[PDB]
Amino acid sequence: MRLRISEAVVLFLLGAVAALIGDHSHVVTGTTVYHTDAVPFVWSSPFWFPILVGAATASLAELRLHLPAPRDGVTARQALGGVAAVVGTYVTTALVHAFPVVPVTALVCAAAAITWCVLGDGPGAACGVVIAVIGPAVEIALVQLGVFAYHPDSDGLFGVAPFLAPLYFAFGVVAALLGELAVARRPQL
Amino acid sequence: MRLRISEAVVLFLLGAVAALIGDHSHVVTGTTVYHTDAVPFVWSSPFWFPILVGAATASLAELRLHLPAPRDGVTARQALGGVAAVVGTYVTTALVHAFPVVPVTALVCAAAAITWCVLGDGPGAACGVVIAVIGPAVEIALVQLGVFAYHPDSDGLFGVAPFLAPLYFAFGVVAALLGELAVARRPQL
Amino acid sequence: MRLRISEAVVLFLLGAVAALIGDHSHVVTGTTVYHTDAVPFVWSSPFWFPILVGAATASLAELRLHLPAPRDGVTARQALGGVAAVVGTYVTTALVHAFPVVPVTALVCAAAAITWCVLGDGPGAACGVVIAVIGPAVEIALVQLGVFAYHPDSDGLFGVAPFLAPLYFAFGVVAALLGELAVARRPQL
Numbered sequence A, B, C: 001m002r003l004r005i006s007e008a009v010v011l012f013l014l015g016a017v018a019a020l021i022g023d024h025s026h027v028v029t030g031t032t033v034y035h036t037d038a039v040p041f042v043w044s045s046p047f048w049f050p051i052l053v054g055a056a057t058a059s060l061a062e063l064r065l066h067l068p069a070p071r072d073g074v075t076a077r078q079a080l081g082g083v084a085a086v087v088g089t090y091v092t093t094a095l096v097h098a099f100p101v102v103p104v105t106a107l108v109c110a111a112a113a114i115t116w117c118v119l120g121d122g123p124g125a126a127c128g129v130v131i132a133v134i135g136p137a138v139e140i141a142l143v144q145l146g147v148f149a150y151h152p153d154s155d156g157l158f159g160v161a162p163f164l165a166p167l168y169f170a171f172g173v174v175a176a177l178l179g180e181l182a183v184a185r186r187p188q189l
């Protein structure tokens, strides 16, 4: 792969920590509820949850590095801003999940579009699209299996929240940026 | 006019779609209520509402092109970001309309100032001022006529919401940017 | 000092006005309650409150000018954006203070990180750290003395809100920027 093992591990850990914060926010606000008592939990989440999101973070970053022209001008400052934007949007969905679906979903779409406008390129958007489809699909399957459920006022997309689509999209854009950063920050002459 | 018909139509449609999303958000949250049963509705709005906002969008864009030095460096990326900022702010007012007037209005003013800081110039601000006056004035007249009303906790500006002033201001700044974009994106040598 | 008296006064007034707006927002939403009837109030605040924040604004700006390489490229546009970001974040804490501590605090941390990413440098962050410690410390002492109290759902940091840490941090970053602006905007050849 294009990522070095150490970079992949850092990205995995970054995704896992952000996932735990966001997922705890969803649980504590009643946005979601788990129904899987048999597995070990880490904070408010089944142990496999931060593993899934962490793995997706490293995978989307790797994917970007296989797409045309990774940007060499990416900085830690841009990456911090992107992570903050995704974390901020994630926790905001926990705060507003009980409100009507259109304004809630529109707000998250606006946040995602602005994140792309500031940080994203074409291949980054493509990564955003990939996870905007796979992310909600995995969740829909999990909900179907009874692993967890969304609050009844946040389950309009086949049992999951419509805001997942732009939330995952923004995640993909930023993970792609993190992959570009991993390469760009390597030692130079 | 400086805009070509096709550009004016695209801007009109853009404004109309964004207006319908925002106005549906206000209606579904109880920010506003219509009292005009005799006219055809489009989604949650009287059919003339998206026409008014769409027309204002094309008109403010046209106005900018009659003001000094339209910027030739404007991009679709900046325009998407501006539309997202205005849509995001519009739907946020629906979410927070029941809160006390000062923090709500201050939040919208902050959003509008940041939108200008990132995207606006002097003439863009002037367009923002024009609609920040005309917009609320039209609404105040409509409310006076009994066409619709604001929620009692959001009607402190002669029967309409004080947040309309910075919301319209930000709309004007972005419409002006869209006018500049319309010209800048034309085919070049 | 590096600031001229007139610049220090403008910064003091700017901080005082923003403090009064934010503090009124906290009082009117029940985020905080004062228990000091013997002193003259200005709007919703004890008269010494805007003096404290105004003084901190001028002091942090002055401090930045004693740290390495004040940036000469700072503009009024950047400064307006920074003030808007801090005011917007301040009033948002009033709106969301009743929600669970983790998502609320994470949202404010995200806002602060983005503010730094867009506007801050190393010395600006250092100023942010200074007030992120001193600010909450002063508040903790004041609460201990019974001068005011936080809402029971917003008092987890020794009697004050955990969101104060990133809120003050962002304040420090922007005050530092205002100090740089004060010097940069002086008449040039």
Ligand SMILES: CCCCCCCCCO[C@@H]1O[C@H](CO)[C@@H](O)[C@H](O)[C@H]1O
Binding pocket: A077, A078, A079, A081, A082, A085, A114, A115, A118, A119, C114, C117, C118
């Ligand atoms: C909602 C997402 C917001 C994330 C914050 C964006 C990162 C902030 C820093 O960005 C960078 O700032 C520099 C100074 O202007 C520019 O030189 C550079 O080109 C730009 O990329």
Ligand SMILES: CCCCCCCCCO[C@@H]1O[C@H](CO)[C@@H](O)[C@H](O)[C@H]1O
Binding pocket: A114, A117, A118, B077, B078, B079, B081, B082, B085, B114, B115, B118, B119
């Ligand atoms: C709250 C409103 C936020 C809207 C989002 C702003 C548009 C994002 C892209 O902007 C543009 O990004 C480029 C990369 O830095 C710069 O080269 C350019 O000069 C700048 O204009």
Ligand SMILES: CCCCCCCCCO[C@@H]1O[C@H](CO)[C@@H](O)[C@H](O)[C@H]1O
Binding pocket: B114, B117, B118, C077, C078, C079, C081, C082, C085, C114, C115, C118, C119
């Ligand atoms: C959440 C905090 C957001 C505050 C808003 C940031 C200030 C907006 C203007 O910034 C400036 O815009 C210019 C145009 O791109 C750049 O030339 C310049 O380098 C950049 O610094």
